[PDB]
Enzyme design. Structure first.
Site, PDB file in Angstrom:
ATOM      1  N   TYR A 258       1.438  -4.825  -7.732  1.00 22.26           N
ATOM      2  CA  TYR A 258       0.873  -5.292  -8.997  1.00 22.26           C
ATOM      3  C   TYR A 258       1.554  -4.767 -10.261  1.00 22.26           C
ATOM      4  O   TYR A 258       1.395  -5.345 -11.334  1.00 22.26           O
ATOM      5  CB  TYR A 258      -0.628  -4.979  -9.058  1.00 22.26           C
ATOM      6  CG  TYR A 258      -1.428  -5.601  -7.934  1.00 22.26           C
ATOM      7  CD1 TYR A 258      -0.940  -6.707  -7.233  1.00 22.26           C
ATOM      8  CD2 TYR A 258      -2.662  -5.077  -7.558  1.00 22.26           C
ATOM      9  CE1 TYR A 258      -1.657  -7.271  -6.172  1.00 22.26           C
ATOM     10  CE2 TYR A 258      -3.394  -5.635  -6.500  1.00 22.26           C
ATOM     11  CZ  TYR A 258      -2.881  -6.729  -5.809  1.00 22.26           C
ATOM     12  OH  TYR A 258      -3.565  -7.252  -4.735  1.00 22.26           O
TER      13      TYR A 258
ATOM     14  N   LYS B 231       1.080   0.515   6.429  1.00 22.03           N
ATOM     15  CA  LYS B 231       1.841  -0.420   7.257  1.00 22.03           C
ATOM     16  C   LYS B 231       3.161   0.315   7.506  1.00 22.03           C
ATOM     17  O   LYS B 231       4.249  -0.240   7.341  1.00 22.03           O
ATOM     18  CB  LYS B 231       2.086  -1.728   6.497  1.00 22.03           C
ATOM     19  CG  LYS B 231       2.511  -2.910   7.375  1.00 22.03           C
ATOM     20  CD  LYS B 231       1.446  -3.279   8.401  1.00 22.03           C
ATOM     21  CE  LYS B 231       1.993  -4.259   9.437  1.00 22.03           C
ATOM     22  NZ  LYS B 231       1.117  -4.432  10.654  1.00 22.03           N
TER      23      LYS B 231
ATOM     24  N   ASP C 125      -3.538  -3.911   9.088  1.00 22.93           N
ATOM     25  CA  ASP C 125      -3.962  -5.053   9.886  1.00 22.93           C
ATOM     26  C   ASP C 125      -5.033  -4.691  10.913  1.00 22.93           C
ATOM     27  O   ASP C 125      -5.856  -5.525  11.269  1.00 22.93           O
ATOM     28  CB  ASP C 125      -2.747  -5.727  10.563  1.00 22.93           C
ATOM     29  CG  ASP C 125      -1.922  -4.768  11.408  1.00 22.93           C
ATOM     30  OD1 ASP C 125      -1.440  -3.746  10.877  1.00 22.93           O
ATOM     31  OD2 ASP C 125      -1.745  -5.044  12.611  1.00 22.93           O
TER      32      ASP C 125
ATOM     33  N   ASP D  74      -7.240  -3.302  -2.414  1.00 23.57           N
ATOM     34  CA  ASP D  74      -7.796  -4.488  -3.039  1.00 23.57           C
ATOM     35  C   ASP D  74      -8.394  -5.383  -1.947  1.00 23.57           C
ATOM     36  O   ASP D  74      -9.585  -5.666  -1.944  1.00 23.57           O
ATOM     37  CB  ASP D  74      -6.683  -5.211  -3.800  1.00 23.57           C
ATOM     38  CG  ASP D  74      -7.196  -6.338  -4.656  1.00 23.57           C
ATOM     39  OD1 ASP D  74      -8.175  -6.112  -5.393  1.00 23.57           O
ATOM     40  OD2 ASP D  74      -6.616  -7.446  -4.605  1.00 23.57           O
TER      41      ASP D  74
ATOM     42  N   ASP E 164     -12.685  -5.770  -0.692  1.00 25.26           N
ATOM     43  CA  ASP E 164     -13.345  -7.063  -0.769  1.00 25.26           C
ATOM     44  C   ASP E 164     -13.910  -7.418   0.586  1.00 25.26           C
ATOM     45  O   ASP E 164     -15.013  -7.945   0.684  1.00 25.26           O
ATOM     46  CB  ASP E 164     -12.364  -8.142  -1.215  1.00 25.26           C
ATOM     47  CG  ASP E 164     -12.248  -8.230  -2.727  1.00 25.26           C
ATOM     48  OD1 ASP E 164     -12.388  -7.180  -3.405  1.00 25.26           O
ATOM     49  OD2 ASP E 164     -12.010  -9.349  -3.236  1.00 25.26           O
TER      50      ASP E 164
END
Lengths: 356, 356
Positions: A141, A190, A222, A246, A250
């Site tokens: 971002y 990751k 994942d 993020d 959610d």
């Protein structure tokens, strides 16, 4: 302990819910010997109106002298058009940066009467009590470059960027958080693919040495993605990079059926932080009495826990929230068991009522 | 209709579940006409043992000759000490790349008697029937630079790089897919921040025109993350970039309680495809007749649809799998309601039986 709190309710239901927090706070504290001074400041559309700027210079001052920030929400149709330069949202992003808050704490715990509402089976979610720590300052971002590239701009790039300081301080915080909770931290990355994740794990592993009592483990993003559904009860504290935090927050935000009353904390190294509900300003339902004060109230509790170490109080507040919910009261948004819909104030009265 | 099929059983339970899938494949294509030929070939540990390499030269030739590849599973403890490129797992990645397959298709469907095994409440997933299409070639996983940089090597970066060609061929194959299904596609991206995501949307929007009768929708990855839980039934076909697809296919892999039998297909622009069950070789139970053929069978089903447009046959197989399950039959891995445990051979016999 003379606590200096900066109240920045903002737009829509912002001030409505904020009032609940303030009432509950005065109660919890004022009865032992704990001063608490509030000082209001504008932010978002409210500030745009009284000072043509989502983030008023005087507000930063107000905050810079306060021990913590209580914030509601921002945004509204009245400003959804003026230059994105001066939109309610920008004033909030600026306040985060200007305060140097890099961590975002999104605790998620189950509530007995909200279980039926959960998308997960009762058994899977009944004991959830986790917290996801999200890195705010670095990642995709903020990473530059980030643009198209000839010939004909048929190539594009976004950059995942991080500094050792950013990754270190966030992880360092996650350990501190886990230390006072259930001493269990799952570092999510990751690492078998990204060099930033590879570096991240190393720093996690390094920091683990300074926190012996904390049980560190690693999990790929994942995997964590399905573990939050299949066995979310296993988590205590999760820490991860910006985009992973993020997406994961959610996902987690709906597992307990309490979305709508989820609290939020934004921290840095010191004990200074900004507390606010996860929900927006819901401009169109303002002044109607239907705003849910719980999220904001739970924020005030986090504030007492993270910014003042007042766990006794912070805990009292939380039980009140559980008990009111235990009796089945909501304001129409939450689908509580044996639900009785009351107004934002009615619900607050029942709260402060429980507080003694 | 003369179809040539490359069959790579692999290791562990691969050969057992491959026999099963072929027997089904045979009986189905028999009663009609459709002449098919199965060209065997080594892969993974079986090939390593026969040529010190996981992806033998002759195997590639056999594939190129074939109209599609039917793959079992690869892996095993016997090669765990060998260097990476001299192990099972690599024959696959090699074969995937070597065939230039850029689309990973992961269908998730609800099976009545498997819901009890899902973490979600039946109401939430009882109607799930979707397919997530993941871009396999580009993204943050391959982009360069990916390194740490001084001062004191305390700045790391990964690059999310994509080229129009990669972004188009995938979105293209997704629309195509949406076409032969419930004509509904969800382009999942993160366009509110990623420049690569903006180009993706743009290309998703312009591509839509070529497929007028397919309803295109745009959804952010973090949101889609909540939605796979809150309301997975809304989806038909999802298409998303490498990383997002990596995380989303994993999350969705559990919502229906059919993890152990999910099918998968690696496709490319034309109609050549590689089909394999999502599950591994499971060496532990190799040879004991305990392997669950369902995954490989549903994969064969996908082959007949995407590589031969033989919709009827595909459906015939899927319906047989459905019926056998409705009767409570499994090999001991699936938690089927009112369960009856049988062997690989038998669950297969019953599928064939359900076919006639």
């Amino acid at each position: 302990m003379k606590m200096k709190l900066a109240v920045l309710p903002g737009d829509g239901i912002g001030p409505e819910v904020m009032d609940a927090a303030i009432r509950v706070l005065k109660t919890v504290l004022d009865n032992d010997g704990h001063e608490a001074v509030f000082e209001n400041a504008l932010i978002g559309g409210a500030a745009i109106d009284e000072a043509g700027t989502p983030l008023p210079e005087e507000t930063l001052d107000i905050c810079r002298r306060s021990d913590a920030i209580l914030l509601g929400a921002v945004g509204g149709p009245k400003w959804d058009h003026n230059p994105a330069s001066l939109r309610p949202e920008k004033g909030l992003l600026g306040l985060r940066k200007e305060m140097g808050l890099f961590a975002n704490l999104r605790p998620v715990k189950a509530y007995a009467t909200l279980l039926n509402a959960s998308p997960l089976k009762r058994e899977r979610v009944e004991n959830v009590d986790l917290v996801i720590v999200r890195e705010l300052t670095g990642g995709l971002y903020f990473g530059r470059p980030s643009e198209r590239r000839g010939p004909g701009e048929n190539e594009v790039v976004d950059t995942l960027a991080y500094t050792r300081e950013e990754i270190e301080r966030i992880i360092e915080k996650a350990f501190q958080l886990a230390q006072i909770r259930r001493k269990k931290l799952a570092s999510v990355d990751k690492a078998n693919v990204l060099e930033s994740s590879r570096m991240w794990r190393e720093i996690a592993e390094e920091t683990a040495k300074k926190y012996p009592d904390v049980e560190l483990s690693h999990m790929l993003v994942d995997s964590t993605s399905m573990q939050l559904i299949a066995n979310p009860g296993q988590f205590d504290v999760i820490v991860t990079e910006n985009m992973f935090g993020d997406i994961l927050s959610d996902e987690a935000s709906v597992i307990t059926g309490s979305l709508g009353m989820l609290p939020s904390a934004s921290l840095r190294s010191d004990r200074f932080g900004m507390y606010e509900p996860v929900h927006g300003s819901a401009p169109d339902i303002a002044g109607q009495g239907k705003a849910n004060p719980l999220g904001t109230v739970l924020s005030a509790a986090l504030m007492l826990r993270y910014s003042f170490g007042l766990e006794k109080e912070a805990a009292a507040i939380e039980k009140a929230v559980d008990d009111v919910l235990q009796d089945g009261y909501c304001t129409g948004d939450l689908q509580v068991a044996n639900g009785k819909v009351v107004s934002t104030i009615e619900l607050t009265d029942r709260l402060i009522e429980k507080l003694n």
